[PDB]
């Protein structure tokens, strides 16, 4: 199987006057490259995929593909939907724009069954010949991809190589890698990055890395080189910022943090997302001062 | 306030050869009309809104509007999205073909805050001047519209007149009606239709009514006439079918039941939704034979 | 079946200098009788059963039995345990001390299976010849008595006549009374007292009634007389006090309220229970402001 | 600080004709000793503490203390209660009988507040001068000891040295050891033994070790030697039996497994505990066939 692993960032999408700040989007991708990030994830959950146009969707994949060209950095483009046929289209259209692989979230809202999840992802995997990483986040989608379906999809479709897990369930990550140790388990939860890596996980798709890419990069590579002492210490050091980046719904805190560090120009979201409360604004701000933030 | 209340049906969308069976859609809406239904809800969750194209969206709202012209039955069109920009368009689009009001689901997947939910629905309500009913289903959206947000939207925007509750939280339904008794609480959960109505609820948007429109209509009208003994008696009789219609995700069981009753032509869904397992097929069929299913 | 229904109070156990204030216990029971209460529950969860000794247990049952002599009030004494041999013993000794019936909590901590719960309660029911009311409170016991187990126990032993439901699950209360309408469903959750009664429940075992016995008495009796309008109106009115009486774990807030109203002399608990935070203390005092508390 | 860490077993309590099989109890404890276990836990949750008398409570501590004399193995006796006055008494009662330390479960059923939990454990710690290990299992107790309360108790009372976590929350296990790395995190959940140990946990209190003590000992000692690959491989091999030992509530499956392996005499529990169904009997019987079960 062809895989995309290592330290990866779920890129935020900066807005300027209600439109995508394309120059800041690319400058932020270059900040990730120069800090040891192995892949960038355009238009993921942290990138506000839900409120971007299909043409803004296309614009930020191209920026990501172009900025990492000539580098070892891959583009795992967000290309998922709760309609399988739309998800198939977005997968084929992400490939046509140079993405090295796709992150495809479990169908949200309409709660498909395990049989439906299998056929949904099976249809996507047969749509393109580039790696496909599953994305399980039941707290946001309202459904769960069971361990059996993940393993079945991994074994039955050749380009499906792993799962991004955001479930706060270390038992499931033991279940997954004990029955199928060949899959690529990816942490989708910054606070528990190290435990997932220490059990055989092979990468991270991080929110914190938007603000602290060097620290997330060091964490993952220490772990992949089995230096768990150094990996655990950065994971322990990052716990406060890892939790405070979820005082409100992602990506509200991380975008607030990037604005407070001066890495984006305006703290703009697209509704129904909005700026945080003024206590969480202040309580994000008080935590950032104990972490050291690299510039451009 | 302008309102749409009473016994309402979240219409299934029958598919035949992968397209919307327009004749059966009309046929079914007239079947609802002739069994005491007060309003129909096209392209709700039970109508597989997520997998229909906008043009399909338009066809079933128009079919519903035309089938109920000249009758008492109202059309509460599904018009919601996890992007406000999109939800405003779908609301206007709905008004545009004669829908009497819109049911607008809480933004799914992207988990807006209470502040974002307020601005989301405030933007929708000021976009149209037809009634807007909120739709809270945290198990599917991953978010909850708090009682404070519901009540504020009810008081701050004149066309927002109530909420369709599908949260299995009778505590919230006393909380809602105790602090704002002028709002229209609508049950989106068939098993507890009577308890919600007995506490002052003014209607249901039902899945079961697709199969047993006469029984659900009678239940609601029994309750609205304060004949709670007869309203509770219909509710108790319906518990078995009300629960078995959720052995798998809605609308998989109800469409199976409609197909087994000979009310639609093929048991077709759009992925990621699919046919049920063979015992839930058997378990839907073995509970269906205990009820009297009205024909055309 | 012999039954104990109507408005019932889970009596708090007042402490003074680490001892049970037997005279203040008798004065709270008298105040319950004179405000329309149909039965009192000594040494329930609200009575701090876990921290009372066996004479205390016996002292408050005898005081309750003697204080309600010459009145219609009945005594449903708490006599349960997560060890079946102790639960049987406490049941037999509750009968020997003049209790009209027993409230038996679902075994806590050790999570018995449905088969174990059946045999547990079957041994209790065969140990005494007084009515037995089951008590399901999964948030505190860690286990749930399923509807089938409750219904099986109701049908197999004459003295098991119903269940005190404290699960915030109006669906389960439809499940129970739809399949076995001869059982006595009793509300163990003040905020949803009216919905449980409106669905055929025949009484409450209340926490708020300690502070506002007349209002809980009026609510319960209005419902049993099918004056649902009046019953919901007291329910809606008490919603604020019903919820804040659980800002901390029961009976911490209710004892704070009784102390703030001057109905007990000292705000004492037995560890691990203690008095609440001073913000919740201040916050309990602020909801009491709109209620009229009866004296002695 | 004095600590009790390493591979530890939550001993089952065998019954024959309704009473504790004292001769088999000693023969199971030495079987644990001869397979590399570092400490045994008499009358814990797996030992059916709730249904043992205080004379069997004293009988099973003395056998454990006496059977491990002249050996390395320590005795961490279960001595807890939801009444602080009983927990203090049982702690002094465990020390006087030769226990090397006490495991004290969070108060069950009566849901103490965080401040009440603090004073509860603070009172216990001053009663004895032997190590105290906190025991958090919210699914059984109905309460959670927060990270702040655990860290406060560890720092304020000299003999409180760590916690036995059974909450399936690896995030909490990062939270605990990142803010207080001197505490002893002990796994109370066999399936996630390795992830908890790899994050700095220093031992397990296991259910599976009753049946496979050598494998749990090797797992813990491989991990404590920072040979995490061999620890992860034993953890992965054990996942199936670790899960099947919870098909029903512990200790129903482990005692069934011990009975099927011929290590105990009778499949007897004390009510409300009971024998499992014939599924779970068959599913325990079929998962055991992949492991090698050491004899006497
Ligand atoms: Mg997220
Ligand atoms: Mg346990």
Q: Which of B168, B171, B177 sits opposite C192 (nearest CB)?
A: B171
User: Which residues of chain D make contact with A177, given a CB cutoff of 8 A?
Assistant: 236
> Residue D48 and residue D51: Cα distance in Å, rounded?
6
Contact predicate D63/D42, CB 8 Å? yes
Identify residues of A whose CB sits under 8 angstroms from chain D CBs.
168-171, 173-175, 177-179, 181, 189, 191-192, 194-195, 198-200, 226, 228, 232, 235-237, 239
CATH class as words, domain B6-231: alpha beta
User: How far does D5 lie from chain C, in Å, by closest CA?
Assistant: 25
Name A74's Cβ contacts closer than 8 Å, sequence gap at least 6: A4, A38, A39, A40, A68, A100, A101
Which chains have 3+ CB pairs within 8 A of B? A, C
Q: How far is CA D66 from CA D28, D99, D205, in A?
A: 13, 9, 20
**Strand B74-78 versus strand B101-105 pairing type:** parallel
> Do C199 and B194 count as a contact with CB atoms less than 8 A apart?
yes
What CATH number labels A6-234?
3.20.20.70
Residues on chain A touching B139 (C-beta within 8 angstroms): 111, 142
- Neighboring chain B residues of A120 at a CB cutoff of 8 Å: 271-272
> For the packed helices B170-179 and B147-156, what is the interaxial angle rounded to 10 degrees?
40
How far apart CA C282 and CA B206 sit, in angstroms, is 43
Q: In the 3-class helix/strand/coil scheme, how is A100-150 assigned residue by residue?
A: CEEEEECCCCCCCCHHHHHHHHHHHHCCCCCCEEEEECHHHHCCCCCHHHH
Query: From residue C146, how far is each of C40, C115, D16 by CA, in Å?
Result: 26, 10, 30
Relative to beta strand A160-165, strand A184-187 is parallel
Closest by Cβ to A194, choosing from D181, D194, D199: D199
Residue B269 phi, psi dihedral angles, 5° rounding = -125, 170
CA dist., res. B172 & res. B177, Å (int): 9
- Determine the residue among B271, B276, B277, B284 to mutate to test chain A binding: the one whose Cβ has the most chain A Cβ atoms within 10 Å: B271
Kindly provide the resolution of this structure in angstroms, with one decimal: 2.4
- Any alpha helices (H) in chain A, and if so which ranges? 22-33, 54-67, 84-96, 114-125, 138-141, 147-156, 170-179, 193-198, 213-224, 228-237, 239-244, 252-260, 278-288
Q: Do D228 and A226 touch (CB under 8 A)?
A: yes
Whether D108 and C111 lie within 8 Å, measured CB to CB: no
C-alpha D240/C-alpha D218 separation (Å) is 17
Nearest to B199 among C168, C175, C232 (CB): C232
Determine contact, residues B130/B161, Cβ cutoff 8 Å: no
- Give the Cα separation of C217 and A191 in Å (integer): 51
Delimit the domains of chain B by residue range: 6-231
Contact predicate D187/D197, CB 8 Å: yes
Chain B residue closest in CA terms to C189? B171
Ligand nearest to the CA of D246: 2
Tokens matching residue D257:
């497994």
Chain A residues near residue B120 by CB distance under 8 angstroms: 271-272
- Is there a catalytic annotation at residue B135? yes
Q: Tell me, in angstroms, the distance from the centre of ligand 1 to residue A44's CA.
A: 9
Angle at alpha carbon of residue D261, lines to D258 and D265, rounded to 5°: 60
Helix, strand or coil for residue D178?
helix
Q: Please, where are the H alpha helices in chain D?
A: 22-33, 54-67, 84-95, 114-125, 138-141, 147-156, 170-179, 193-198, 213-224, 228-244, 252-260, 278-287
Residues of B with CB under 8 A from a CB of C: 168-171, 173-175, 177-179, 181, 189, 191-192, 194-195, 198-200, 226, 228, 232, 235-237, 239
C135 noted as active-site residue = yes
Spatial distance between the Cα atoms of D105 and D135, rounded to a whole number of angstroms: 4
Q: Which of C174, C178, C195 sits opposite B199 (nearest CB)?
A: C195
Q: Catalytic residue, from C25, C121, C135, C259: name it.
A: C135
| Chains with ≥3 CB–CB distances under 8 Å to D | A, C
Rounded to an integer, what distance in angstroms lies between the CA atom of residue C97 and that of residue C119?
A: 25
Q: Strands D74-78 and D101-105, how do they pair?
A: parallel
| 3-class SS shares of chain C: helix, strand, coil, % to 5 | 50, 15, 40
Task: Check D25, D118, D121, D135 and give the catalytic one.
Answer: D135
**8 A C-beta contact, residue B221 and residue B7:** yes
CB B154 within 8 A of CB B161: yes
Q: What is the distance in angstroms between the Cα of B191 and the nearest Cα belonging to chain C?
A: 6
C195/B200 touch (CB, cutoff 8 Å), yes or no = no
The SS3 call for residue A230 is helix
Distance of CA C45 to the CA centre of its chain: 7
Report the distance separating Cα D3 and Cα D161, nearest Å. 6
Give CA–CA dist D61/A179, Å, rounded.
39
User: Can you list the pairs that D27-32 forms with residues at least 24 positions away whose Cβ atoms lie under 8 Å?
Assistant: D27/D296, D28/D210, D28/D263, D28/D264, D29/D63, D29/D64, D29/D67, D29/D68, D30/D67, D31/D213, D31/D263, D31/D294, D31/D296, D32/D73, D32/D209, D32/D210, D32/D213
Q: How far is CA A81 from the centre of its chain?
A: 15
Query: How far does CA D154 lie from the centroid of its chain?
Result: 19
Architecture per CATH, D6-236: Alpha-Beta Barrel (3.20)
Does A236 contact D181 at a Cβ distance shorter than 8 Å?
A: yes
Write down the experimental method used for this entry: X-ray
Contact A207, A245 (CB under 8 A): yes
Peptide bond into D251 cis (omega under 30): yes
In whole angstroms, how far apart are CA A188 and each of A185, A202, B98, C139, D152? 9, 12, 45, 30, 31
- Report residue C48 as tokens: 């701090």
Quick one: angle between helices A252-260 and A278-288, nearest 10?
A: 60
Q: What are phi and psi of B103, to 5 degrees?
A: -100, 120
**Contact (Cβ atoms closer than 8 angstroms) between residue C65 and residue C99:** yes
Token pair for C72: 């219609």
The residue of B12, B109, B137, B143 whose CB has the most chain A CBs within 10 angstroms, and thus the best one to mutate to test that interface, is B109
């Amino acid at each position: 199987k062809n895989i995309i692993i290592g330290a990866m960032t779920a890129l935020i999408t900066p807005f300027k006057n209600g439109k995508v700040d394309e120059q800041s989007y690319a400058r932020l991708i270059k900040r990730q490259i120069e800090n040891g990030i192995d892949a960038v994830v355009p238009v993921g959950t942290t990138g506000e995929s839900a409120t971007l146009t299909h043409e803004e969707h296309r614009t930020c994949i191209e920026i990501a593909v172009e900025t990492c060209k000539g580098t070892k950095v891959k583009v795992l483009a967000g290309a998922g939907s709760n309609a399988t046929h739309e998800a198939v289209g977005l997968a084929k259209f992400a490939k046509e724009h140079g993405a090295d692989g796709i992150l495809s979230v479990a169908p949200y809202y309409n709660k498909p069954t395990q049989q439906g999840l299998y056929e949904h992802y099976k249809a996507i995997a047969q749509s393109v010949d580039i790696p496909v990483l599953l994305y399980n986040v039941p707290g946001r989608t309202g459904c769960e991809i069971s361990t059996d379906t993940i393993i079945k999809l991994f074994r039955d479709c050749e380009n499906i190589y792993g799962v991004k897990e955001a479930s706060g369930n270390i038992d499931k990550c033991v279940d997954l890698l004990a029955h199928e140790p060949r899959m690529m388990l990816i942490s989708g939860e910054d606070a528990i990055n190290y435990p997932i890596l220490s059990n055989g996980g092979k990468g991270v798709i991080s929110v914190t890395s938007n603000l602290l890419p060097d620290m997330i990069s060091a964490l993952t590579h220490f772990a992949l080189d089995e230096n768990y002492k150094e990996a655990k210490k950065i994971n322990d050091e990052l716990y406060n910022i890892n939790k405070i980046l979820f005082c409100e719904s992602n990506p509200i805190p991380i975008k607030t943090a990037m604005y407070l560090a001066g890495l984006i120009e305006s703290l703009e979201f697209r509704l129904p997302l909005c700026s945080p409360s003024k206590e969480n604004f202040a309580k994000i701000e008080e935590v950032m001062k104990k972490y050291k933030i690299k510039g451009f």
